[PDB]
Amino acid sequence: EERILALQLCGWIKKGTDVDVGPFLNSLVQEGEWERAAAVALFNLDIRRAIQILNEGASSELNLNVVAMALSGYTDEKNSLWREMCSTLRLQLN
Amino acid sequence: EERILALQLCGWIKKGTDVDVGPFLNSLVQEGEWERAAAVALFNLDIRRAIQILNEGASSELNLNVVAMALSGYTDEKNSLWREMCSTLRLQLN
Numbered sequence: 001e002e003r004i005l006a007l008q009l010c011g012w013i014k015k016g017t018d019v020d021v022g023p024f025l026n027s028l029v030q031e032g033e034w035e036r037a038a039a040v041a042l043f044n045l046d047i048r049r050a051i052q053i054l055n056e057g058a059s060s061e062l063n064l065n066v067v068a069m070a071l072s073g074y075t076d077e078k079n080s081l082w083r084e085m086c087s088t089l090r091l092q093l094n
Numbered sequence: 095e096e097r098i099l100a101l102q103l104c105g106w107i108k109k110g111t112d113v114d115v116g117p118f119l120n121s122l123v124q125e126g127e128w129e130r131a132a133a134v135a136l137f138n139l140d141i142r143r144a145i146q147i148l149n150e151g152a153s154s155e156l157n158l159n160v161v162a163m164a165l166s167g168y169t170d171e172k173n174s175l176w177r178e179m180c181s182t183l184r185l186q187l188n
Contacts, residue, residue, distance in 0.1 A: 062157070062186075063157050066157060066161055066187065069183045069184075070167065072176045072180060073169065073180075075167065081167075085163055089159050089162060092156060092159045093159065
């Protein structure tokens with residue numbers, strides 16, 4: 001319950017017994033914060049929603065498409081090539 | 095013997111029997127063709143060199159960083175998440 005209250009104070013979920021950040025993601029999409037919406041959707045364990053949001057953002061305003069396509073290469077292997085490369089060059093993203 | 099001659103006529107390899115495309119890659123990086131070098135390096139079955147070329151290219155003159163991250167997640171699983179979206183989103187690249 002304390003974590004839910006903290007989330008509500010952070011604004012990720014509306015007050016009450018909400019169990020999703022769907023309204024928050026929609027509000028972020030409407031506002032125009034594509035990257036923040038994608039990050040929030042990924043923090044809620046949804047790669048598909050993050051990719052969809054990034055594709056929608058790339059439709060408006062090009063790099064978001066390749067960002068979402070890069071995000072789709074998530075692998076659980078510790079020695080995976082994607083893990084190493086994304087860890088190394090993540091700092092170069094604007 | 096015919097295939098190696100054909101690559102020479104395409105310029106991919108230097109004059110001789112040297113089974114490598116490394117000298118060709120260096121000229122392309124010098125010539126400034128950075129996206130072509132990544133493709134030529136990849137076609138010789140070298141992701142890491144393709145990532146290195148894109149990373150080196152993105153460092154000078156920043157979308158190539160993400161392309162390197164996107165290329166680093168090559169998964170050969172038939173129903174993988176990467177192949178599901180990268181195949182669809184590849185058509186939206188400049």
